[PDB]
């Protein structure tokens, strides 16, 4: 008995939370093994992991199985509003266009799905970007503070206060441009490709199936991640200030001084994020099936 | 129950060499990383070195690189620290620590058991 929007918001949020918490121990072990040398350097670890199974036996055996979900609450407080806004807005923009595959032509309908995905991504980003910046600032200040380094902020509000006072709204949305281009591509292909391919391939007994929905979302996230990766290279590279003027000069100078290949480097890692995203989409549809 | 008792160390001339011992009682020694630290009055404590439980890998600090050499004996349950080419600034109370092998800790100063330390004074 709530609006059509708030329902999607809550469905997207819940589905995002379930998806993140589900894929949490795999990402935990992935990080643990990937960043073990830097831990030996900082004195956080004493000897390497002679295997993924040993990494499990080790961490879980000392502090319990729950140790696998360390740091997940922060990822859920980041991811919940992000995906909630994304899904609610996708269905809204989809209804704003309101294309019927049969009434308006398949290519125009798919363009409707892609446009909706992109628009929703851009809107969510506009709302959550400053929060991501502030949480990051506070976390880095906490690490420096942990090691005896001088503190800069009391809390999030202090981050907002100080950054607003020095650079204004631009300070909070620092490096927004390549961020919104990348997200309009990524969310466009994410929502657009999933919704456009789902009725085509998932027909008959697969119309209500979940494993099929997750696998389709898995492909979609894989491909979309790969397609949106160069804008992520330009984004990360431009926010590295914490060397280039405008994303177009960063693009041209990187392609000319490193190569086109350099932009794509680091693409393989997205593979686990690909699971999370995929799970959010499938769990969402399933969640709507039981709801309506 | 578990005690870390520092052995060796006294007053020595500059440039001479010392060996400090660390006797660990009450625990499985063949499974604990041993660490060496020092504390001098007016100076914040600093981590010297660390050695794995099986005596496979050793790690040092930039301040005592190549000068100090850490080792251990599981048959005697002792950790050794060899101090060479000493300078007057090395004058400190050297203490010993121990922690389980392969547990992730917040940093260098996070250990299970701590010793009380042996005074080391370097004359000029
Ligand atoms: C789509 C494709 C866009 C694209 O390809 O652009 C690439 C291009 C890349 O340029 P770049 O290399 O990053 O250049 C940036 C400079 O280097 C310098 O970069 P910088 O770090 O100084 O950048 C600061 C950043 C800082 O940006 C901000 O401060 C934005 C603050 C928004 C606050 C909103 C709060 C809401 C709560 O400014 C921006 O780059 C984006 C400003 C856009 C703000 C638009 C917000 C208007 C909303 C008004 C809505 C009113 C109607 C509502 C109707 C409701 C019914 O970025 C753009 O210029 C497009 C931005 C489009 C924003 C659309 C927002 C929706
Ligand atoms: C989060 O930090 C992002 C960083 C911003 C822009 C990145 C652009 C490069 C393209 C890569 C996109 C991958 C997305 C974030 C996919 C991420 C996934 C999981 C995760 O990040 O934990 C998978 C998925 O849901 O598809 C912020 C500030 C907002 C994101 C929004 C609004 C959005 O996701 O809707």
Residue numbers in the entry:
A (entry chain A): 11 to 252, 257 to 306
B (entry chain B): 1 to 124
Quoted passage from the original study:
The archetypal member of the family, the ADP/ATP carrier, performs the vital role of transporting ADP into the mitochondrial matrix and ATP out of the mitochondrion to maintain high cytosolic ATP concentrations for energy-requiring reactions (Kunji et al., 2016). The carrier cycles between the cytoplasmic-open state (c-state), which can be trapped by the membrane-impermeable toxic inhibitor carboxyatractyloside (CATR) (Vignais et al., 1973), and the matrix-open state (m-state), which is locked by the membrane-permeable bongkrekic acid (BKA) (Erdelt et al., 1972, Henderson and Lardy, 1970). Mitochondrial carriers consist of three homologous sequence repeats of about 100 amino acids, which form a 3-fold pseudosymmetrical structure with the translocation path through the center of the molecule.
To solve these problems, we targeted the BKA-inhibited ADP/ATP carrier from the moderately thermophilic fungus Thermothelomyces thermophila (TtAac), carrying a single mutation (Q302K) in the cytoplasmic network that increases the thermal stability (King et al., 2016). Furthermore, we selected a nanobody against this state and crystallized the complex (see STAR Methods for details). The crystal is composed of alternating layers of carrier and nanobody molecules, with crystal contacts between the carrier layers being mediated by the nanobodies. The BKA-inhibited m-state has a central cavity open to the mitochondrial matrix side of the membrane, with the matrix helices rotated outward. In the m-state, the cavity is closed to the cytoplasmic side of the membrane by a cluster of residues that includes those of the cytoplasmic salt bridge network. The structure reveals that in the m-state, the charged residues of the cytoplasmic salt bridge network, part of the conserved [YF][DE]xx[KR] motif, come into close proximity and form electrostatic interactions, linking the even-numbered transmembrane helices of each domain in agreement with functional data (King et al., 2016). BKA inhibits the carrier by binding deeply and asymmetrically within the central cavity. BKA interacts directly with all residues of the putative substrate-binding site (Kunji et al., 2016), forming electrostatic interactions with K30 and R88 and a hydrogen bond to Y196. Comparison of the ATP and BKA binding geometries shows that the dicarboxylate end of BKA mimics the phosphate groups of ATP, while the polyunsaturated backbone of the inhibitor acts as a partial mimic of the adenine ring of the substrate, sitting in the hydrophobic pocket. A noticeable difference between the BKA- and CATR-inhibited states is that the CATR-inhibited state is highly symmetrical, in agreement with the presence of three homologous sequence repeats, whereas the BKA-inhibited state is 3-fold pseudosymmetric at the cytoplasmic side but somewhat asymmetrical at the matrix side.
